[PDB]
Amino acid sequence: YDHRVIDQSAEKIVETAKRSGADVSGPIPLPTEKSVYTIIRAVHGYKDSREQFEQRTHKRLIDIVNPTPKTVDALMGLNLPS
RNA sequence: AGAACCUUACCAAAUCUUGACAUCCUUUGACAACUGCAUGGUUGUCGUCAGCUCGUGUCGUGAGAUGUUGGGUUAAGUCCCGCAACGAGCGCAACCCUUAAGCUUAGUUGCCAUCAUCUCUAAGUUGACUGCCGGUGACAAACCGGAGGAAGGUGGGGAUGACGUCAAAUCAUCAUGCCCCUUAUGAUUUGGGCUACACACGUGCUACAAUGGACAAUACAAAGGGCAGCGAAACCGCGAGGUCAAGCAAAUCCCAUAAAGUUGUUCUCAGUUCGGAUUGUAGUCUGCAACUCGACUACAUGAAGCUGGAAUCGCUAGUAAUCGUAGAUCAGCAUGCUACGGUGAAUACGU
């Protein structure tokens, strides 16, 4: 989802990786697909007001050279809300 | 944003009557099931047209004026010069995700300069504010221009839809003045009905030709989708089916080595060798079902139509003409509906 939280975490993971002995090689951003809804704005009798609603989901995997198992244990729990 | 029994909302038989939609020890079945003209709220509309104004001082017996008039500019009471006026908030402008050349930075299921086997992907930031420039316009807010300009003077668009509406579209999205149904069709299965036709019609569509018909073999993008489920490669009635087999939880697997197209191109205007409606017996998907009432496939079959009276409407270059596609509502069907890519011509002297 939101991108003010994930890249806020994208340098704390290095602090976890440089704690146990993991060397990072730039985890890369992944693309984002926008699902498109277009519902009518008035209910009865009318059609031609087509209100716009979307939804965003930013994919992001973590690509390094040396995933050390003392680092991976606290890796994927800082990005996604409920 | 899907009529085979859809929402039985409507109509016949039956049924149950706190139930069969908030209900019930899962049709009673210990258990596994054996009136918008009374109203809120959203919104249709003039209208992406630019305005509707109040505090507060004064002139007027008084409703009311003045400021908002005037001089010039100016998308727009937009901006600066005058005056019995002085301020002031609303919205276009203003806050802006998305848009058009960047360095440090970040090398996947991605691009590898070299051996061969830059951007998208987001981030603080960088850039056009008349900021300064020759003119003149009181120097007072603009002028073709221009130094940085790949990007002109709101760059190209979009969420942005005023004050105020025509008791006007909606009691069928939704609660209630009447509980917009609770014991009446109120509700539950098949069956009928929305689906037929003499016509009138909103609007779109396959077309009427050689700006072409057979089009076999023949290059490329973008934007989506998937453990409801995406189904290639070698390769089955050529074909209705994408069998078989692999990969698939998402850039890779698949949809899908699309589309404008180029070398072939035999046809000679023969109502056709242009064209589709539909007929007609076998044949696939679907389930309880293909009568009334689906949708695909080709062998065999082709009536009106040789570019359209009076009449209607679209639009200034990434639109117009359109071949092609990308999705939700589904066991199953839309040209609808709405998000992307290719060539991309015509015309602005003026009111």
How many other C-beta atoms are found inside a 10 Å radius of the C-beta of residue A12? Answer: 11
Nucleotides on chain B that have an atom closer than 7 A to a protein CB are 1, 41-45, 106-109, 121-124, 159, 169-173, 224-225, 250-251, 337-339
Q: Are A71 and A17 in contact (CB under 8 A)?
A: yes
Q: Which among A56, A68, A61 is positioned nearest to A32, based on CA atoms?
A: A56
Resolution value, angstrom units: 3.6
CA–C1' gap, A21 and B157, in angstroms: 51
Whole-Å CA distances, A56 to A45, A59, A60, A81: 32, 10, 13, 13
Element (H, E) at A12: helix A12-20
Method underlying the structure: cryo-EM
> Residues near chain B (nucleic strand), Cβ < 7 A?
A 3-4, 6-7, 25-39, 41-46, 48-50, 52, 58-59, 61, 63
